[PDB]
Short mmCIF file of all heavy atoms in Angstrom, two decimals:
data_model
loop_
_atom_site.label_atom_id
_atom_site.label_comp_id
_atom_site.label_asym_id
_atom_site.label_seq_id
_atom_site.Cartn_x
_atom_site.Cartn_y
_atom_site.Cartn_z
N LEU A 1 12.25 -16.93 14.37
CA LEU A 1 13.19 -18.05 14.37
C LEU A 1 12.95 -18.98 13.20
O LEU A 1 13.89 -19.44 12.56
CB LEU A 1 13.10 -18.81 15.69
CG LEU A 1 14.13 -19.94 15.81
CD1 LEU A 1 14.65 -20.00 17.23
CD2 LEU A 1 13.50 -21.27 15.40
N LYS A 2 11.68 -19.28 12.91
CA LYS A 2 11.38 -20.19 11.80
C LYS A 2 11.76 -19.61 10.45
O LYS A 2 12.04 -20.39 9.53
CB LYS A 2 9.90 -20.57 11.84
CG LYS A 2 9.55 -21.38 13.09
CD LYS A 2 8.63 -22.56 12.80
CE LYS A 2 8.96 -23.74 13.71
NZ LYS A 2 7.79 -24.17 14.50
N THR A 3 11.79 -18.29 10.30
CA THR A 3 12.29 -17.69 9.07
C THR A 3 13.81 -17.66 9.03
O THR A 3 14.41 -17.97 7.99
CB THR A 3 11.71 -16.28 8.89
OG1 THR A 3 10.31 -16.37 8.60
CG2 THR A 3 12.41 -15.54 7.75
N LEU A 4 14.45 -17.29 10.14
CA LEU A 4 15.91 -17.33 10.17
C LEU A 4 16.42 -18.75 9.91
O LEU A 4 17.42 -18.95 9.21
CB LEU A 4 16.44 -16.82 11.50
CG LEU A 4 16.85 -15.35 11.62
CD1 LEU A 4 15.83 -14.47 10.94
CD2 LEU A 4 17.01 -14.97 13.08
N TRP A 5 15.72 -19.74 10.47
CA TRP A 5 16.13 -21.14 10.38
C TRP A 5 16.30 -21.57 8.94
O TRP A 5 17.22 -22.35 8.63
CB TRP A 5 15.08 -22.00 11.10
CG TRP A 5 15.51 -23.41 11.39
CD1 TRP A 5 15.37 -24.51 10.59
CD2 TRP A 5 16.19 -23.87 12.56
NE1 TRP A 5 15.89 -25.62 11.20
CE2 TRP A 5 16.41 -25.25 12.41
CE3 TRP A 5 16.64 -23.24 13.73
CZ2 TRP A 5 17.05 -26.02 13.39
CZ3 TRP A 5 17.26 -23.99 14.69
CH2 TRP A 5 17.46 -25.37 14.52
N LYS A 6 15.44 -21.08 8.04
CA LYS A 6 15.42 -21.45 6.62
C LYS A 6 16.41 -20.65 5.77
O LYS A 6 16.54 -20.94 4.57
CB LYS A 6 14.02 -21.24 6.03
CG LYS A 6 13.01 -22.38 6.18
CD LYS A 6 11.59 -21.83 6.41
CE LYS A 6 10.70 -22.78 7.20
NZ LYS A 6 10.93 -24.21 6.84
N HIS A 7 17.09 -19.66 6.33
CA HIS A 7 18.01 -18.84 5.56
C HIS A 7 19.18 -19.71 5.09
O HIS A 7 19.63 -20.61 5.81
CB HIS A 7 18.51 -17.69 6.42
CG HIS A 7 19.33 -16.67 5.67
ND1 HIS A 7 20.65 -16.86 5.36
CD2 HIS A 7 18.99 -15.46 5.18
CE1 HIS A 7 21.10 -15.81 4.71
NE2 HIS A 7 20.11 -14.94 4.58
N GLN A 8 19.69 -19.44 3.88
CA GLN A 8 20.77 -20.26 3.34
C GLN A 8 22.01 -20.28 4.24
O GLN A 8 22.82 -21.20 4.13
CB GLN A 8 21.16 -19.77 1.94
CG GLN A 8 21.66 -18.33 1.90
N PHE A 9 22.16 -19.30 5.13
CA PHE A 9 23.33 -19.14 5.98
C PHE A 9 23.07 -19.55 7.43
O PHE A 9 23.93 -19.32 8.29
CB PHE A 9 23.76 -17.68 5.93
CG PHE A 9 24.42 -17.29 4.64
CD1 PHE A 9 24.67 -18.25 3.67
CD2 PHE A 9 24.92 -16.01 4.45
CE1 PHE A 9 25.31 -17.90 2.48
CE2 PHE A 9 25.52 -15.65 3.27
CZ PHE A 9 25.73 -16.61 2.28
N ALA A 10 21.92 -20.16 7.72
CA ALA A 10 21.56 -20.50 9.09
C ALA A 10 22.26 -21.75 9.62
O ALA A 10 22.34 -21.93 10.84
CB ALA A 10 20.04 -20.71 9.22
N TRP A 11 22.76 -22.61 8.74
CA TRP A 11 23.15 -23.94 9.18
C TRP A 11 24.27 -23.94 10.21
O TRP A 11 24.25 -24.82 11.08
CB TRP A 11 23.49 -24.81 7.97
CG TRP A 11 24.57 -24.29 7.10
CD1 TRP A 11 24.43 -23.49 5.99
CD2 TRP A 11 25.97 -24.52 7.26
NE1 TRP A 11 25.67 -23.22 5.46
CE2 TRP A 11 26.63 -23.85 6.21
CE3 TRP A 11 26.74 -25.24 8.18
CZ2 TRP A 11 28.02 -23.86 6.08
CZ3 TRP A 11 28.11 -25.26 8.04
CH2 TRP A 11 28.74 -24.57 7.00
N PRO A 12 25.26 -23.03 10.20
CA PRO A 12 26.28 -23.09 11.25
C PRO A 12 25.73 -22.79 12.62
O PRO A 12 26.39 -23.10 13.62
CB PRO A 12 27.30 -22.02 10.84
CG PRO A 12 26.99 -21.72 9.38
CD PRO A 12 25.52 -21.93 9.25
N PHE A 13 24.54 -22.20 12.69
CA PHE A 13 24.00 -21.68 13.94
C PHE A 13 22.80 -22.48 14.44
O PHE A 13 22.17 -22.09 15.43
CB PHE A 13 23.63 -20.20 13.75
CG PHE A 13 24.79 -19.36 13.24
CD1 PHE A 13 24.88 -19.01 11.90
CD2 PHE A 13 25.79 -18.95 14.10
CE1 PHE A 13 25.96 -18.25 11.43
CE2 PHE A 13 26.87 -18.20 13.64
CZ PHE A 13 26.96 -17.86 12.31
N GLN A 14 22.51 -23.63 13.81
CA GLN A 14 21.35 -24.43 14.17
C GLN A 14 21.62 -25.38 15.33
O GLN A 14 20.72 -26.11 15.75
CB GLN A 14 20.85 -25.21 12.96
CG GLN A 14 20.08 -24.35 11.97
CD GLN A 14 19.79 -25.04 10.65
OE1 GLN A 14 20.30 -26.11 10.36
NE2 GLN A 14 18.95 -24.40 9.84
N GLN A 15 22.84 -25.37 15.87
CA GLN A 15 23.21 -26.25 16.97
C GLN A 15 24.44 -25.66 17.64
O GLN A 15 25.10 -24.78 17.08
CB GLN A 15 23.49 -27.68 16.46
CG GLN A 15 24.60 -27.74 15.42
CD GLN A 15 24.17 -27.22 14.03
OE1 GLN A 15 23.17 -27.66 13.47
NE2 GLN A 15 24.91 -26.23 13.50
N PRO A 16 24.76 -26.11 18.86
CA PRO A 16 25.96 -25.61 19.54
C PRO A 16 27.21 -25.82 18.70
O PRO A 16 27.32 -26.80 17.96
CB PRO A 16 26.02 -26.45 20.82
CG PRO A 16 24.60 -26.84 21.09
CD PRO A 16 23.98 -27.02 19.71
N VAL A 17 28.14 -24.88 18.81
CA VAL A 17 29.47 -25.07 18.23
C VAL A 17 30.08 -26.36 18.76
O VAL A 17 30.28 -26.53 19.97
CB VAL A 17 30.36 -23.87 18.53
CG1 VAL A 17 31.82 -24.21 18.14
CG2 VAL A 17 29.90 -22.67 17.71
N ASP A 18 30.39 -27.28 17.85
CA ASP A 18 31.05 -28.54 18.18
C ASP A 18 32.54 -28.32 18.00
O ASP A 18 33.10 -28.49 16.91
CB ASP A 18 30.52 -29.65 17.29
CG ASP A 18 31.06 -31.01 17.65
OD1 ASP A 18 32.11 -31.09 18.32
OD2 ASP A 18 30.44 -32.00 17.21
N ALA A 19 33.19 -27.88 19.09
CA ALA A 19 34.61 -27.54 19.01
C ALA A 19 35.47 -28.74 18.63
O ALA A 19 36.55 -28.58 18.05
CB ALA A 19 35.08 -26.98 20.35
N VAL A 20 35.01 -29.94 18.97
CA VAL A 20 35.75 -31.14 18.60
C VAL A 20 35.68 -31.36 17.11
O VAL A 20 36.70 -31.53 16.44
CB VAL A 20 35.19 -32.35 19.37
CG1 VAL A 20 35.83 -33.62 18.86
CG2 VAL A 20 35.39 -32.15 20.85
N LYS A 21 34.46 -31.38 16.56
CA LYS A 21 34.32 -31.65 15.13
C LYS A 21 35.03 -30.59 14.30
O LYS A 21 35.69 -30.89 13.30
CB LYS A 21 32.84 -31.71 14.74
CG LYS A 21 32.61 -31.97 13.22
CD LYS A 21 31.11 -32.08 12.94
CE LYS A 21 30.65 -33.51 12.72
NZ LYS A 21 29.22 -33.50 12.29
N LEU A 22 34.90 -29.33 14.72
CA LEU A 22 35.46 -28.24 13.93
C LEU A 22 36.94 -28.01 14.21
O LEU A 22 37.54 -27.13 13.58
CB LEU A 22 34.69 -26.95 14.20
CG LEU A 22 33.19 -27.01 13.95
CD1 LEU A 22 32.58 -25.71 14.49
CD2 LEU A 22 32.89 -27.18 12.45
N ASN A 23 37.54 -28.78 15.12
CA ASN A 23 38.93 -28.60 15.50
C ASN A 23 39.20 -27.16 15.92
O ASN A 23 40.10 -26.49 15.41
CB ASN A 23 39.88 -29.03 14.37
CG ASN A 23 41.32 -29.05 14.81
OD1 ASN A 23 41.61 -29.35 15.97
ND2 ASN A 23 42.24 -28.75 13.90
N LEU A 24 38.37 -26.68 16.86
CA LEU A 24 38.50 -25.36 17.45
C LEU A 24 38.69 -25.55 18.94
O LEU A 24 37.81 -25.21 19.75
CB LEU A 24 37.27 -24.49 17.19
CG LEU A 24 36.91 -24.19 15.74
CD1 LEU A 24 35.63 -23.38 15.73
CD2 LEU A 24 38.06 -23.47 15.05
N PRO A 25 39.83 -26.13 19.35
CA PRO A 25 40.01 -26.49 20.76
C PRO A 25 40.01 -25.29 21.68
O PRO A 25 39.84 -25.44 22.90
CB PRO A 25 41.37 -27.21 20.76
CG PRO A 25 42.09 -26.59 19.58
CD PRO A 25 41.05 -26.34 18.54
N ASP A 26 40.20 -24.09 21.14
CA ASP A 26 40.18 -22.85 21.90
C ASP A 26 38.79 -22.23 22.02
O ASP A 26 38.63 -21.27 22.78
CB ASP A 26 41.11 -21.84 21.22
CG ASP A 26 40.73 -21.60 19.76
OD1 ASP A 26 40.44 -22.58 19.03
OD2 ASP A 26 40.78 -20.44 19.34
N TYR A 27 37.79 -22.73 21.28
CA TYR A 27 36.54 -21.99 21.19
C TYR A 27 35.90 -21.81 22.57
O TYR A 27 35.52 -20.70 22.95
CB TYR A 27 35.55 -22.67 20.24
CG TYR A 27 34.27 -21.88 20.09
CD1 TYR A 27 34.14 -20.88 19.12
CD2 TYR A 27 33.18 -22.12 20.94
CE1 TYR A 27 32.98 -20.16 18.99
CE2 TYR A 27 32.01 -21.41 20.83
CZ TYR A 27 31.91 -20.41 19.85
OH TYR A 27 30.75 -19.70 19.73
N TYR A 28 35.84 -22.88 23.35
CA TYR A 28 35.21 -22.75 24.66
C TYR A 28 36.17 -22.31 25.76
O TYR A 28 35.76 -22.20 26.92
CB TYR A 28 34.51 -24.05 25.06
CG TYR A 28 33.28 -24.31 24.23
CD1 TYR A 28 33.26 -25.32 23.27
CD2 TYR A 28 32.15 -23.53 24.38
CE1 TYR A 28 32.13 -25.54 22.49
CE2 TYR A 28 31.02 -23.74 23.60
CZ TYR A 28 31.01 -24.76 22.67
OH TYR A 28 29.88 -24.97 21.91
N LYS A 29 37.43 -22.06 25.42
CA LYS A 29 38.34 -21.33 26.30
C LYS A 29 38.17 -19.83 26.18
O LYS A 29 38.67 -19.08 27.03
CB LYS A 29 39.77 -21.69 25.95
CG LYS A 29 40.03 -23.19 25.85
CD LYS A 29 40.57 -23.70 27.15
CE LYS A 29 41.48 -24.88 26.94
NZ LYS A 29 40.72 -26.12 27.24
N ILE A 30 37.48 -19.38 25.13
CA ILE A 30 37.27 -17.97 24.86
C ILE A 30 35.81 -17.58 25.02
O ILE A 30 35.50 -16.52 25.59
CB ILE A 30 37.77 -17.63 23.44
CG1 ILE A 30 39.30 -17.77 23.38
CG2 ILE A 30 37.32 -16.22 23.03
CD1 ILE A 30 39.86 -17.83 21.98
N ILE A 31 34.89 -18.41 24.54
CA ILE A 31 33.46 -18.14 24.60
C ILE A 31 32.91 -18.78 25.86
O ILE A 31 32.90 -20.01 25.99
CB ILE A 31 32.76 -18.65 23.34
CG1 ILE A 31 33.33 -17.95 22.09
CG2 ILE A 31 31.24 -18.45 23.42
CD1 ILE A 31 33.34 -16.44 22.19
N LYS A 32 32.47 -17.97 26.82
CA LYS A 32 32.02 -18.52 28.08
C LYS A 32 30.51 -18.54 28.24
O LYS A 32 30.01 -19.21 29.16
CB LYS A 32 32.69 -17.77 29.25
CG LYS A 32 34.23 -17.84 29.24
CD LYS A 32 34.76 -19.29 29.32
CE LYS A 32 36.27 -19.36 29.48
NZ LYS A 32 36.76 -20.79 29.48
N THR A 33 29.75 -17.88 27.36
CA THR A 33 28.29 -17.92 27.35
C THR A 33 27.82 -18.34 25.97
O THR A 33 27.31 -17.52 25.21
CB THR A 33 27.70 -16.55 27.71
OG1 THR A 33 28.26 -16.11 28.95
CG2 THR A 33 26.17 -16.62 27.80
N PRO A 34 27.95 -19.61 25.62
CA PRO A 34 27.61 -20.04 24.27
C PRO A 34 26.12 -19.98 24.01
O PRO A 34 25.29 -20.12 24.93
CB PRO A 34 28.10 -21.49 24.21
CG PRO A 34 28.82 -21.75 25.46
CD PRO A 34 28.57 -20.67 26.44
N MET A 35 25.77 -19.83 22.74
CA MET A 35 24.37 -19.92 22.40
C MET A 35 24.25 -20.13 20.90
O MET A 35 25.17 -19.81 20.14
CB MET A 35 23.60 -18.69 22.92
CG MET A 35 22.22 -18.52 22.34
SD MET A 35 21.27 -19.66 23.40
CE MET A 35 21.90 -19.42 25.08
N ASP A 36 23.10 -20.67 20.50
CA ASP A 36 22.83 -21.08 19.13
C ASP A 36 21.32 -21.09 18.95
O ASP A 36 20.56 -21.10 19.93
CB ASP A 36 23.41 -22.47 18.87
CG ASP A 36 22.75 -23.53 19.72
OD1 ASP A 36 23.16 -23.68 20.89
OD2 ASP A 36 21.81 -24.17 19.21
N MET A 37 20.87 -21.11 17.69
CA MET A 37 19.43 -21.10 17.43
C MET A 37 18.75 -22.43 17.73
O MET A 37 17.52 -22.45 17.91
CB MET A 37 19.09 -20.71 15.98
CG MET A 37 19.54 -19.35 15.55
SD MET A 37 18.71 -18.83 14.03
CE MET A 37 19.23 -20.11 12.91
N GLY A 38 19.47 -23.56 17.75
CA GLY A 38 18.83 -24.79 18.20
C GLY A 38 18.41 -24.70 19.66
O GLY A 38 17.30 -25.09 20.04
N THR A 39 19.31 -24.17 20.49
CA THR A 39 19.01 -23.90 21.90
C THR A 39 17.85 -22.92 22.04
O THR A 39 16.93 -23.13 22.85
CB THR A 39 20.27 -23.38 22.60
OG1 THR A 39 21.28 -24.39 22.56
CG2 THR A 39 20.01 -22.94 24.04
N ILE A 40 17.87 -21.82 21.27
CA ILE A 40 16.79 -20.85 21.36
C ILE A 40 15.46 -21.49 20.98
O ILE A 40 14.44 -21.27 21.64
CB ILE A 40 17.10 -19.62 20.47
CG1 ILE A 40 18.31 -18.88 21.05
CG2 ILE A 40 15.87 -18.72 20.33
CD1 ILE A 40 18.90 -17.84 20.04
N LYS A 41 15.45 -22.28 19.91
CA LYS A 41 14.23 -22.97 19.49
C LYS A 41 13.69 -23.87 20.60
O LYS A 41 12.49 -23.89 20.89
CB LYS A 41 14.50 -23.78 18.23
CG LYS A 41 13.29 -24.47 17.65
CD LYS A 41 13.43 -24.65 16.15
CE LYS A 41 13.44 -26.11 15.78
NZ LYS A 41 12.07 -26.57 15.44
#
């Protein structure tokens, strides 16, 4: 996890999808088991 965390492409996955900020009002209507590397950490 600590190596993935530092990858240049890790930043979208370091916290839960913020459907409000990203204007993805459908995201949690489709994804019912969310997960992210912040949660895993």
